[PDB]
Nucleic acid binder design. Structure first.
Ligand SMILES: Nc1ncnc2c1ncn2[C@@H]1O[C@H](COP(=O)(O)OP(=O)(O)OP(=O)(O)O)[C@@H](O)[C@H]1O
Ligand SMILES: Nc1ncnc2c1ncn2[C@@H]1O[C@H](COP(=O)(O)OP(=O)(O)OP(=O)(O)O)[C@@H](O)[C@H]1O
Ligand SMILES: Nc1ncnc2c1ncn2[C@@H]1O[C@H](COP(=O)(O)OP(=O)(O)O)[C@@H](O)[C@H]1O
Lengths: 603, 318, 408
DNA sequence: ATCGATCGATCGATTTTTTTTTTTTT
DNA sequence: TCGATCGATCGAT
């Protein structure tokens, strides 16, 4: 046709006419970017469409099926023409959309939203597994033994190799194309409810390129399109025809983004190596760690480290060693510490929702024998399974039922679970990171008087814990003036890094680079651990074990990761040993200088 | 068979259908042995062969045939992204001579095919000439392709009278010391004699292990290693005192699914007999002295049995 | 329930609504519908014909979902919006009077007489917070706790039995009226839809409004230990039935404690006058306890309050300010975007330093957070932005009343 | 003598539910 | 035992 040809032709004169990012427009190269990796999930910007040709908003809703099909033909006739070798792997394409100027909450859509462009979100619940489908109409003639030929509706023409005969037929289990399939149950978040009632829900279908992407209990973003089951048995009716509803999936965005994620600017991506090789920027960990609270540099830098690290270093056959680490700050009820942690949750890739008083650690509907009675009888074991290679947020350690804080005592080093008490004995890894900022016994805080006296956390656990910190406070007028000025200024927001980047710096650092160690001075750690244990025997000396001297060299690797050095010299090792001198002096007596006098020669 | 390359369950999709493959997984359990046959004297059409109406077909099963049928199973391996998930699994199919070829709880190589039975229609797979695994000896658990060479090397190792003090340093190529602790973590595997007699006394065959101590001495790695090195399983606490009298929603009966069962020639290791309370210690009070695991719940008294040993870690207060 | 007979069951009716009628009904409401009963397209063993056994049904196409309606704030005059504060003609006066503080204090408690110190404070709770424009640092909070303790029945409860009827969205009751389902919804373990449904409660039914309690002391330490976090980091979570439960409460509170022995014998510290767990007694930023004594003048004044409770003509005292104008002025006073540019904003450092010069003989800056919010509220009361240095001094006085009230 | 409507002999298609034993939490 | 299928048949045209 004349006009009804122009759609693909405008896509053709789009993907090499519209430009952003100072030349070499993305879709000139995004498509080959994706044909390299054998993905077949090209994605479109709507805002770019509004920037180039705003015509494609009214022409769409009258049948967006045909819009998407006329899209995919263009990707085919581009790619398989320009990469003719490609026609081996998949030989099929479709496109995606991720820019819509509207988020339609649930319980808001009706018959007016029929068969047209949508955006909606919510939460997953139980649904089916993974199954394939059909794709094409082909039969096998049974009178004359031929095949009828290739052709929610049946076709069955009389034309066929059997003298256009043989109304009868039979079917093979091959030579016809198939299609993966899966279902979902979309429920709305229990935050944005009508405050205390049942929720509403719809079902959704997603298709073959989109499977093993979702999961039970997840955050969500989908364009989708509104379906219409064409007949749920129209007949003598109820007080309602038995009609139903689905949305069909075009494109998802997940909100957690637990992978290496963001697409790349042409020049504003090497901002890493615009500054990251200068010396002073070790302490630029802190200038965007949490510009919140005047003092407290040490503990926040320590968190900044423990958020930065990860390594498996699995030797031959033995085990998985360790790459995620225990922290704590069992200080005092008042120090602004709660607030330290929320920056981690809103900044880091992967984490979890909990306070103290979780389950009994048995878990919400964990043990359940497997039948299709009671509608599949949901299974889970806690939450560490649900955030691996992420972090756990906990507070009020000293305020939990002991027999759950018991149960959490396996992940820490072994990083694994193992269960029974059903019809099953399946097993599973728990690889993630712990952090807690709880409160002790006794009101506020003792003086520099010892720790094991100061809170009822037993011996065979706080050994599994390694890196300690304590927010000790006492009264000086000067710093009280200083921080008061800081706070009042902090409520003068009326009307050196941003958070924009260290997210990406840590993704680059934790994913790609995989550092090591070399023989440098590693005998001296022996003397220092020996001084540690010999000068600390019975005072507060129970938590002097081998993981916290795993930690030192591992933290050195984390330091050089913060440099992307990929190896390291004495500098970061001395820094780690310095930090531990610091903390382990902090949590000992009013005679706070024992290791000080014992250590000025190293310092 | 072949040696091409193994795959993973997460790529079994529509394109890999009616087509040969190779994978590597792990097993949980599989069915019994009902039947299936080839011919006798699917649609069985209309004609008869005064009238004889509309499909009067009498099977002559004196003249029918008979082959086997077993329905094997497969779960994935623990290192192919179950991290943000749990492991899925699959059910299978086996035909004529390969029942009693795989007991559950083993590592497999597999040669199979992904084909259907009836557009949401169903999956399944069968064997197209199974073989097995060599995770060291991935499948060497019941049969023998060991050769006189292997028996020779073995028994030539046996008379070598510097093998036991050699084997007290075998488990840890990374840990120091702790040798008298270790001289009988290896004998626990070997087992002694299960000597029954003309009277009742089926006396206790295997042995059993204990340890409790302050952390910081490498308990966990050692027990994980004893799991690693013939067949065994591991949990620790939180799991049972009951056994599995559930009900298949098909037919509504009281079947017995049955996992000290799964160490009847293997063994078992656990940590935390401590931090699992007493509602599930009494069934295991019993099992490990007589091995006649009894059942008396509903109208069944099938006191089956299982020969298992046991290993115990612990944590004492303070 | 407007037709409550005896005998038979609550006979159920089927009933239908059209499109624009949809989703403006809700659970818990009494109605006025249409009456358009219809022919509805086993055990009915009557005679059968043809040239069939029906049941009963019904539809209706009109709604008056009354007894669940307030309407927010829209003198017919000019204003920011249509009717949000069209009473400028008088609100101009209600924002410029100099005795307005006391005229407001005595404008809601004419049927009451006691102390005159929480009649000047508790407007605090209904009054605004901050609502400022900042970055993604964190939540910044607007409203704050209050507490009451007292001797047996000096009208501890009539303060609040009415306050629920005073402002909207803020329904009150106790939680020991029910299970521990005050915080969480009813924990269910039988199959109706998917065997575990806990997405509600009763405390969280007060979002952007208050839901106070009575008998604050005798309640189990599960809801209460959950309160230990739920009031500041105003985001609550659970396990054992939670689809990684992420809720949000937002709101203030009012306490209803009762001493240990039911007396105020000053033989022990306050923290031992109640002898509970401690850290909670800071985030409650003002207590203002009511005391009992034995003096006849007060009690005769009370009885002569009852002299004008039932003398059916003029059974109360005259007043100066009516309630509706008060409430509308209050609900106008929030939407202002306050401002801070004042030397008190520069010079609160010495006020706090002096506060802790007195405390140089519990402690610190939770109270400070309160302080600047108490006073930014008392300047909201001045129908004005642009913080001033006097609301400071009043707030400082209230602070010191609270602490020296706590002092032995 | 051509053709549509009605009759009637010919064909194939439907018929499984109430207790129990473990399990998490008050 | 119920239903449409299909083929035959009887007046109109
Ligand atoms: N030194 C400080 N710097 C910045 N903000 C502070 C400081 N002290 C208190 N605050 C503010 O006070 C509020 C209380 O936070 P804080 O972490 O002190 O409570 P908390 O100690 O966690 O109490 P709990 O440990 O019982 O949860 C926070 O909003 C915080 O911003
Ligand atoms: N004697 C040792 N020699 C070498 N490495 C050791 C030794 N003991 C412990 N380790 C190191 O510490 C880890 C072992 O700790 P393990 O998990 O046994 O503690 P645990 O026994 O589980 O503590 P708990 O009994 O309190 O749980 C190993 O990963 C190992 O690298
Ligand atoms: N100053 C006062 N003004 C009005 N009523 C008062 C005053 N002092 C005491 N009362 C009376 O004291 C009673 C207190 O009862 P209340 O404390 O509500 O019982 P409970 O302790 O069971 O809640 C009120 O009913 C009120 O009549």
């Amino acid at each position: 046709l004349g006009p009804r040809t122009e759609i693909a032709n405008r896509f053709q004169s789009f993907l090499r006419t519209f430009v952003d990012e100072r030349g070499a427009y993305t879709y000139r190269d995004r498509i080959r970017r994706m044909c390299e990796q054998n993905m077949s999930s090209f994605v479109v910007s709507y805002t770019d469409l509004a920037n180039k040709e705003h015509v494609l908003a009214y022409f769409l809703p009258e049948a967006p099926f045909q819009m998407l099909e006329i899209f995919d033909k263009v990707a085919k006739d581009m790619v398989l023409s320009i990469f003719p070798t490609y026609e081996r792997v998949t030989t099929e394409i479709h496109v995606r959309i991720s820019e819509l100027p509207l988020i339609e909450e649930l319980r808001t859509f009706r018959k007016l939203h029929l068969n047209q462009l949508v955006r909606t979100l919510g939460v997953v619940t139980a649904t089916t597994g993974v199954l394939p489908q059909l794709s094409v109409i082909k039969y096998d003639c049974v009178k004359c033994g031929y095949v009828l030929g290739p052709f929610n509706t049946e076709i069955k023409p009389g034309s066929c190799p059997e003298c256009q005969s043989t109304g009868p037929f039979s079917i093979n289990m091959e030579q016809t194309l198939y299609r993966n399939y899966q279902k979902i149950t979309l429920q709305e978040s229990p935050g944005r409810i009508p405050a205390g009632r049942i929720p509403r829900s719809k079902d959704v279908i997603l298709l073959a390129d989109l499977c093993d992407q979702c999961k039970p209990g997840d955050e969500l973003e989908v364009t989708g399109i509104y379906t219409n089951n064409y007949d749920g048995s129209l007949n003598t009716d109820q007080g309602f025809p038995v009609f139903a509803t689905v949305i069909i999936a075009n494109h998802v965005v997940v909100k957690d983004s637990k992978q290496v994620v963001q697409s790349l600017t042409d020049e504003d991506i090497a901002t890493i190596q615009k500054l990251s090789k200068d010396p002073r920027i070790v302490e630029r960990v802190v200038a965007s760690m949490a510009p919140s609270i005047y003092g407290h540099d040490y503990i926040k830098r320590a968190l900044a480290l423990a958020l930065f690290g990860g390594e498996s270093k699995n030797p031959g056959e033995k085990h998985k060693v360790r790459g995620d680490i225990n922290l704590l700050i069992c200080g005092d009820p008042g120090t602004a510490k709660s607030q330290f942690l929320k920056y981690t949750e809103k900044v880091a890739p992967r984490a979890v929702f909990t306070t103290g008083q979780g389950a009994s650690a048995v878990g919400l509907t964990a043990y359940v024998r497997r039948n299709p009675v009671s509608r599949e009888w949901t299974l889970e074991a806690g939450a560490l399974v649900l955030a691996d290679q992420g972090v756990c947020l906990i507070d009020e350690f000293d305020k939990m039922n002991d027999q759950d804080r018991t149960s959490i005592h396996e992940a820490m080093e072994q990083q694994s679970i193992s269960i029974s008490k059903a019809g099953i004995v399946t097993s599973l890894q728990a690889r993630c990171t712990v952090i807690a900022a709880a409160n002790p016994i006794g009101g506020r805080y003792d003086p520099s008087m010892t720790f094991s006296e100061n809170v009822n956390l037993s011996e065979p656990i706080l050994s599994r814990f390694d890196v300690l910190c304590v927010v000790k406070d006492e009264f000086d007028p000067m710093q009280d003036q200083q921080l008061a000025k800081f706070v009042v200024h902090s409520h003068m927001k009326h009307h050196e890094i941003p958070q924009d980047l260290l997210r990406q710096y840590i993704v680059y650092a934790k994913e790609n680079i995989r550092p090591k160690l070399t023989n440098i001075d590693e005998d001296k750690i022996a003397k220092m651990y020996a001084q540690l244990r010999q000068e600390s025997f019975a005072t507060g000396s129970l938590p002097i074990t081998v993981r916290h001297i795993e930690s030192v060299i591992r933290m050195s690797e984390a330091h050089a990761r913060m440099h992307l050095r990929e190896n390291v010299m004495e500098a970061d090792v001395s820094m780690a040993i310095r930090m531990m001198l610091e903390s382990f002096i902090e949590a000992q007596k009013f005679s706070v200088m024992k290791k000080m006098r014992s250590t000025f020669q190293k310092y | 068979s072949s040696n091409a390359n193994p795959t993973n369950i997460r790529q079994l999709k529509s394109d890999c259908v009616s087509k040969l493959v190779k994978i590597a997984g792990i097993i949980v359990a599989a069915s019994g042995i009902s039947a299936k046959a080839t011919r006798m004297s699917y649609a069985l059409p209309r004609k008869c062969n005064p009238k004889c109406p509309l499909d009067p077909f009498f099977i002559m099963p004196d003249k029918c045939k008979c082959v086997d049928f077993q329905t094997l199973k497969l779960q994935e391996l623990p290192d192919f992204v179950p991290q943000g998930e749990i492991p899925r699994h699959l059910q299978l199919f086996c035909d004529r001579s390969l029942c009693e070829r795989v007991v559950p709880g083993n590592r497999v190589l597999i040669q199979g095919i992904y084909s259907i039975r009836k557009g949401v229609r169903a999956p399944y797979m069968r064997v197209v000439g199974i073989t097995v695994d060599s995770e060291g000896a991935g499948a060497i658990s019941r049969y023998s392709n060991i050769t006189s060479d292997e028996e020779e090397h073995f028994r030539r190792m046996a008379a070598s009278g510097d093998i036991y003090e050699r084997l007290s340093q075998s488990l840890a190529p990374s840990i120091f010391g702790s040798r008298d602790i270790k001289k009988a973590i290896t004998c626990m595997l070997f087992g002694g004699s299960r000597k029954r007699l003309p009277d009742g006394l089926c006396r206790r065959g295997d042995i059993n292990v204990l340890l409790l101590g302050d952390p910081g001495t490498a308990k966990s790695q050692l027990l994980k290693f004893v799991e690693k090195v013939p067949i065994a399983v591991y949990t620790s606490g939180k799991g049972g005192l009951t056994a599995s009298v559930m009900k298949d929603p098909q037919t509504r009966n009281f079947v017995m699914e049955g996992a000290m069962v799964l160490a009847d020639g293997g063994v078992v290791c656990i940590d935390e007999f401590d931090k699992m309370r007493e509602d599930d210690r009494v069934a295991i009070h019993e099992a490990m002295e007589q091995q006649t695991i009894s059942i008396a719940k509903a109208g069944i008294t099938t006191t089956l049995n299982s020969r298992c040993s046991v290993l115990a870690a612990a944590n004492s207060i303070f | 329930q407007a037709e409550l007979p005896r005998g038979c069951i609550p006979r159920a009716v089927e009933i239908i609504l059209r499109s624009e009628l949809v989703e403006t009904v809700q659970a818990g409401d009494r109605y006025d519908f249409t009456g358009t009963l219809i022919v509805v397209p086993l055990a009915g063993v009557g005679t059968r014909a043809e040239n069939l056994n029906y049941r009963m049904a019904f539809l209706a196409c009109s709604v008056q979902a009354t007894t669940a309606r307030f309407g927010g704030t829209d003198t017919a005059e000019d204003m920011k919006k249509q009717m949000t504060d069209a009473e400028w003609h008088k609100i101009y006066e209600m924002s410029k009077d100099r005795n307005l503080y006391q005229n407001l204090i005595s404008s809601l408690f004419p049927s009451i007489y006691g102390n005159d110190e929480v009649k000047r404070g508790i407007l605090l709770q209904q009054f605004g917070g901050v609502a400022k424009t900042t970055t993604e640092k964190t939540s910044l909070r607007g409203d704050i706790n209050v507490c009451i303790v007292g001797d047996p029945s000096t009208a501890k409860s009539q303060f609040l039995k009415q306050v629920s009827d005073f402002s909207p969205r803020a329904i009150y009751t106790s939680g020991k009226a029910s299970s521990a389902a005050g915080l969480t919804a009813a924990v269910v373990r039988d199959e109706e839809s998917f065997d575990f449904v806990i997405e509600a409660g009763a405390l969280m039914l007060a979002d952007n409004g208050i839901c106070c309690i009575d008998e604050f002391d005798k309640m189990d330490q599960r809801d209460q230990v959950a309160i230990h976090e739920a009031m500041e980091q105003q985001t609550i979570s659970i396990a054992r039935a939670g689809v990684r439960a992420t809720l949000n409460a937002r709101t203030s509170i009012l306490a209803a404690a009762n001493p240990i022995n039911g007396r105020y014998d000053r033989s022990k510290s306050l923290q031992q006058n109640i002898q509970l767990s401690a850290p909670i007694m800071s985030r409650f930023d003002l207590f203002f306890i009511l005391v009992d004594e034995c003096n006849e003048v007060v009690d005769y004044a009370i009885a002569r309050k009852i002299v004008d409770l039932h003398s059916n003509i003029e059974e109360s005292v005259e007043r100066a300010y009516t309630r509706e104008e008060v409430l509308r002025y209050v609900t106008f006073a929030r939407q202002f975007k306050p401002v801070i540019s004042q030397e008190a904003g520069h010079m609160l450092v010495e006020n706090y330093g002096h506060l802790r010069q007195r405390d140089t003989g519990r402690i610190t800056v939770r109270q400070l957070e309160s302080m600047i919010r108490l006073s930014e509220a008392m300047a909201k009361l001045e129908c004005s932005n642009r913080v001033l240095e006097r609301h400071v001094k009043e707030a400082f006085r209230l602070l010191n009343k609270s602490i020296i009230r706590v002092e032995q």
